[model samples]
Target: GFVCNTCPEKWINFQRKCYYFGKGTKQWVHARYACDDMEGQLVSIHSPEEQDFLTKHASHTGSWIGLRNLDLEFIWVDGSHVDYSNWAPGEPTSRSQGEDCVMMRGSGRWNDAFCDRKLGAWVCDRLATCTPP
Candidate 1:
């Protein structure tokens, strides 16, 4: 038999995780830190399936993901290695001087942008259950 605890009504569930899609906008780093205080982290899309799910449900204004450029190298905020990507054409261009954070378009494509810019919404991911304390 297959059974699992359910996520909150306001959250979307996938696999064993719960996702919170924010309506308000915030800077990439700010949102990341906010999520940290919420006991979660920005979402890390590891496969096309996950990306597809997120894209379908995400806002058209775009949303920040967990990918960021650290010292000229891209890494997931959770320290997981990168094995998949969905960058838009000519994306991750890092066109500006401080472009380092990644955002996901409603179409499921990704692009690099300045971390301080508050141009998109954000998503947070965390476990789907409460642990005994």
Candidate 2:
């Protein structure tokens, strides 16, 4: 078999990672655990390309992502730095606000939403285990 970046059945592949856009809606916290159930985590918007890909599929629907404002600063659930993002203007506007969960809006931009609110869908991501020889 040809060696290449790979993923589980039905998952979309981009670069070295696999992504799953879930059809079922869930609270932000539940969505995180849902991804964890698949041995992955909620999709972390790592770059412009990755963000664009997610936005296209998740567009027109509010979808959950891995980023959240735990305290004062936003953090990716996968434990990486929040170096990349596509925020809707004036979003993440306040740290003290109850909106801590991150949602991909209809325009494919990020909004800090309420954690307990159910989004229309969610995204999950993980590294592709296979590699080129």
Candidate 3:
């Protein structure tokens, strides 16, 4: 039997997840769709250690993750429960009445921003190629 233990080119492998960091900026929705087109979604982080992994690979300006305020509370785009968050002080402020999308700062802290604002680089997440157990 043969096993492939790596992600597709241009993606970073961590645990069983493959992450793709976009090189350009896009609106949050646009970024989500971009990931969807690639058969993935915006990265959904489940722990501080996971957050740290993303933060280390993230752009210095920051990158959008898979959390957003949909109904007055944050939720992952993958429909996972809101089990963890690492927001910086004074963040998730939902500034300007429509700050709903989440971004991970270079410092590993989270921030909320306008979904339509085109300042979001994105990280896409999906399972890496491997043999089925």
Lowest lDDT 10-residue stretch of candidate 2: 1-10
Sort by lDDT, best first: 2, 3, 1
Instruction: Decide which is better by lDDT, 2 or 3.
Output: 2
Candidate 2: tens digits of C-alpha lDDT, residues 50-71: 8877777784778898998864
Error of 1 at 3 (Å): 3.2
How close to the true structure is residue 89 of candidate 1, measured as C-alpha lDDT?
Answer: 92
Residue-wise lDDT of candidate 1 within 8-118, one digit each (tens)?
767888776789887686999888987898778999888788888888788898899999987747899899867988999987675565788899888889988888889
The TM-scores of all predictions, comma-separated, are: 0.87, 0.91, 0.87
Candidate 2: misplaced stretches above 4 Å? Answer: 1-4
Who is ahead in lDDT, 1 or 2? 2
Question: Of 1 and 3, which scores higher on TM-score?
Answer: 3
C-alpha lDDT score of every prediction, in listed order: 0.83, 0.84, 0.83
RMSD to the hidden true structure, all candidates: 3.3, 2.1, 2.5
Superposed model 3: Cα runs more than 4 Å off: 1-5, 94-96
Question: In model 3, how large is the Cα lDDT of residue 35?
Answer: 91
For model 3, what is the error of residue 27's alpha carbon versus the real structure, in angstroms, after optimal superposition?
0.6
Scored by lDDT, the top model is: 2
